[PDB]
């Protein structure tokens, strides 16, 4: 979230240009989802959780 809000508020400096912009935002949201996988795993198996 810190890196997301850093790019979001610095969305115009030549190094975020060099980072490719929104393709990098896609990468970083992918990292966010890969992290939330851990939050999802420790929960009770139930039925929906095992599917997700």
């Amino acid at each position: 979230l810190f890196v997301v809000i850093t790019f979001v508020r610095y969305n115009d400096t030549p190094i975020v240009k060099a980072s490719g912009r929104e393709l990098s935002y896609v990468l970083l949201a992918g990292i966010f989802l890969c992290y939330a996988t851990t939050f999802l795993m420790i929960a009770e198996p139930d039925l929906g959780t095992c599917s997700l």
Partner: protein
Amino acid sequence: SAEDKAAVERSKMIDRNLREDGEKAAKEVKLLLLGAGESGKNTIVKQMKIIGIVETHFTFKDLYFKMFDVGAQRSERKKWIHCFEGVTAIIFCVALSDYDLVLAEDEEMNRMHASMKLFDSICNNKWFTETSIILFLNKKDLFEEKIKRSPLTICYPEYTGSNTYEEAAAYIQCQFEDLNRRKDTKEIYTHFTCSTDTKNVQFVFDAVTDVIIKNNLKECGLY
């Protein structure tokens, strides 16, 4: 429309040829060539060729170059230079030996200031914003031979350097590059050349390659 199907066939074949030739031409790089009279553009064009509008074709490791020599047109540049808007290089040739010369049939206007005035008119023209200028400070040897005696102050009264060659040519480069106002977007690739086998073709190749990459990185917003 039994025969008009053949007409559509002709149209499709012509469109195919059109697209192939168009992509072949858009493959190639277009370089303007301009400068004052006797700026030494002949020597420069001879070097790249060894490796109305006069079109000269040369290749340097693919990336086939077409060069357009325009000095031949004594006419209104304002209504002509609205063309050449798609050139990815504007080779400007100026001879540093012009600093010493008072006249070019132009009311004792110093040839150097005449060249700078033409450079100002062409670099800042609003047709050319993304096109990059490659600056050939030609005849570096004859300048080095002249500066040893005749002070650059005859051309640039505010110059206070020791008339040593490096401190003079660096001043001319600094002045020509500071003459470009829209430096935020435009780039000036100043180089020193003379009548010898320099890397001027290699330098044109490198500057053109860099400008191409800069343009493409603007296309995707990476730069």
